[PDB]
Amino acid sequence: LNEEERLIRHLFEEKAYNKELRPAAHKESVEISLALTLSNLISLKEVEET
Amino acid sequence: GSMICYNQQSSQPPTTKTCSETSCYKKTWRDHRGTIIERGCGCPKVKPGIKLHCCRTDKCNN
Amino acid sequence: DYTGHITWTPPAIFKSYCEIIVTHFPFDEQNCSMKLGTWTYDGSVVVINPESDQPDLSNFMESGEWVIKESRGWKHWVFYACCPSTPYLDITYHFVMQRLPLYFIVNVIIPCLLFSFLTGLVFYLPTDSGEKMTLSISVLLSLTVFLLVIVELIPSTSSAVPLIGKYMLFTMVFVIASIIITVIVINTHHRSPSTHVMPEWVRKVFIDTIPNIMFFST
Amino acid sequence: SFQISYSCNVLIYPSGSVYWLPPAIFRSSCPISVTYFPFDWQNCSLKFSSLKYTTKEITLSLKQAEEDGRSYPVEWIIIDPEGFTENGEWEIVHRPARVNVDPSVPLDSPNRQDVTFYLIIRRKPLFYVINILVPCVLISFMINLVFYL
Amino acid sequence: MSTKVYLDLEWTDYRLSWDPEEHEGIDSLRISAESVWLPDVVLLNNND
Amino acid sequence: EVALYCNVLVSPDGCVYWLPPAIFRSSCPVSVTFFPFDWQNCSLIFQSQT
Amino acid sequence: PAEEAGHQKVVFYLLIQRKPLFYVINIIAPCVLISSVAILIYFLPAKAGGQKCTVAINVLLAQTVFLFLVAKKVPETSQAVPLISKYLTFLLVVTILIVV
């Protein structure tokens, strides 16, 4: 626990992390990379179009 | 009649076993986390989308 | 406990995906699995071990439709080519189960058998009754109406043709062949000298070659 | 149901990279073309975007994977070949993935950028051929028999 | 009738005004809806 | 669990009264031999979870 | 085990009898009547215009419609055959024998 708890206390208490703020400058955009894994295809309901 | 096949997973340290079959196989595929390589005996039937390499020689699946 | 041991037994409703083989339906055997694992922790930080080789069936309620013949749990280590120091662990509990087929035997197979028996009855009904086509067409209509029952009761899967579906298609083709052959017989029965001339091969076969075996008058 | 199903843990690394793999069960609108039923194929899509942030705040892109030290964008839906069970009636023919930015909407609209994963799927007609189509055709072709009666 | 829609609600909160030149040119903010006063706008004729 | 978590009624002797209402869907194995002239024996098993 | 949690149980039992009036009115009595129609073919003449086979086979068609009606109402377990399913199968077989 020692280094894990120390790191959490360093990142979120000592550094005062704010989840409401973006990790970027105000005029800068954050690059989000997306991928999708299809675990399984359940159904295509024709009448309900879903 | 016997044979020596490899059977280690992916990039683990190599291991070997005794195949009573006439082929050894390497089986490669890729899920969302990375590439898996499975080595063993025979020539199994694989699902579509899986690379398969069967070979009839000692220590031939690597 | 005072030693730090934690036991946690939460309930859950597990909805799992399972390859269903309908080749032998309603006499099919299924093998359905539940793969469990730590989603965000790999084997190097959290090790999961099975409590027993088998899942616990002591508090298992008897199922209405299935009998669980076999059950086991297997732990799997998965290594990737990129990282040879961190395994990924899972525990897969599989259950091999057998369907009880009585419902589909009673509600699908038996009426199909009765219609198949009715199919051949039209060939003992004389043509002078004026009821051959009524009988055959009505058997076909009963089969068509029973198709509603079957589409209601049988799964709509295209992975394979169910055995019971093969029996259905066989019975359907059987009735249709009966209707075609009955039309041929009825057409033969109203052949007249004014319209047709008896071929010599028909006289050679159907008068002497076969009826000599039977007991009537040429 | 806009959101992912299970809000799992994120993994953070010393470089500051954040990895997150939430699983989700999604019900989306796939318009159905019935023209060639039961020999039809459908084109469904899963359109992912942020309604909380715009193109000025975040930039959507595909994942960049590596092979032999060379990077490539993952332009497809990942399906694990070993663990995937095919749907009982739908086979998958194409699995493309795209980043779409349309200029019609204003730039301050969160709907400007999106990442779309498409499934082009062909129906397996075996159930309908066996249970409906063949009996229907064979009964319909018996209408020619009244000319022999 | 089942519909999927996007509402468009515009109003003025005098308490949430600031001088952009006193805050390094920030002229717009994206604040979680639970943190600000919302009008209590609801669909009155919902069936469910 | 129960449908509504209402108030308890505490008395001076410390004895607590609680009457929560509940909608319950319980498992009843249906004996089908004499359907529709059948009778069923349904059960509601209550126990402490912890 | 006394230390385990869920072993002392309070069990409330409900022994409930089904009121079968809906099935009597809408399924059983009409099926009985329609099946008893088939007994009348023994009084029709055995010639053209008597219509024995028409009556019997159309009764069977009606019984198949009744199979569809009950198919949406019977439970789908397999320890026992329901009484209504047994009776409908019996009526079917009786109609088959009448046709024979």
Show the helix and strand layout:
This is part of a larger assembly, with two copies of chain A, one copy of chain B (62 residues), one copy of chain C (218 residues), one copy of chain E (48 residues) and two copies of chain F.
Chain B: E1 3-6, E2 16-19, E3 24-30, E4 35-41, E5 51-55
Antiparallel strand pairs in B: 1-2, 3-4, 3-5
Chain C: E1 29-36, E2 66-78, E3 88-99, H1 102-119, H2 132-153, H3 163-189, H4 200-209
Antiparallel strand pairs in C: 1-3, 2-3
Chain E: no helix or strand
Detailed description of the structure:
The PDB classes it as membrane protein. The entry lists the keywords Bovine muscle, nicotinic acetylcholine receptor, membrane protein. The structure is cut from a larger assembly and holds 2 copies of chain A, 1 copy of chain B (about 60 residues), 1 copy of chain C (about 220 residues), 1 copy of chain E (about 50 residues) and 2 copies of chain F. Helices cover about 25% and strands about 10% of the residues of chain A. Chain A contains 1 helix and 1 strand, in the order αβ. By secondary structure, chain B is mainly beta. Helices cover about 0% and strands about 45% of the residues of chain B. Chain B contains no helices and 5 strands. Chain C is about 35% helix and about 15% strand. Chain C contains 4 helices and 3 strands, in the order βββαααα. Chain C has helices spanning about 100-120, 130-155, 165-190, 200-210, and strands at about 30-35, 65-80, 90-100. Classes of the chains: A alpha+beta (about 50), B mainly beta (about 60), C alpha+beta (about 220), E little secondary structure (about 50), F mainly beta (about 50). At the A-D interface, strand 1 of A face strand 3, strand 4 and strand 9 of D.
Number of strands of chain C: 3
Measured between the Cα atoms of the first and last residue of chain C, the distance is: 100 Å
What global shape of chain C is seen?
rod-shaped
The helix tally of chain C amounts to: 4
What integer value in Å does the Rg of chain F equal? 18 Å
The main sheet of chain C comes to:
3 strands, antiparallel
Q: Beta-strand percentage of chain C?
A: 15-25%
Biggest β-sheet of chain F, characterized?
2 strands, antiparallel
Oligomerization:
part of a larger assembly
Structural class of chain F: mainly beta
Helix content of chain C: 25-40%
What portion of residues of chain F belong to β-strands?
A: 15-25%
- Give the SSE order of chain F as H and E letters: EEE
Q: Roughly how many Å apart are the termini of chain F?
A: 13 Å
Instruction: State the shape of chain F.
Output: elongated
Based on DSSP secondary structure assignment, what is the total number of beta strands of chain F?
Answer: 3
Percent helix among the residues of chain F? under 10%
Rg on CA atoms of chain C, Å: 31 Å
Q: Please, how many helices of chain F?
A: 0
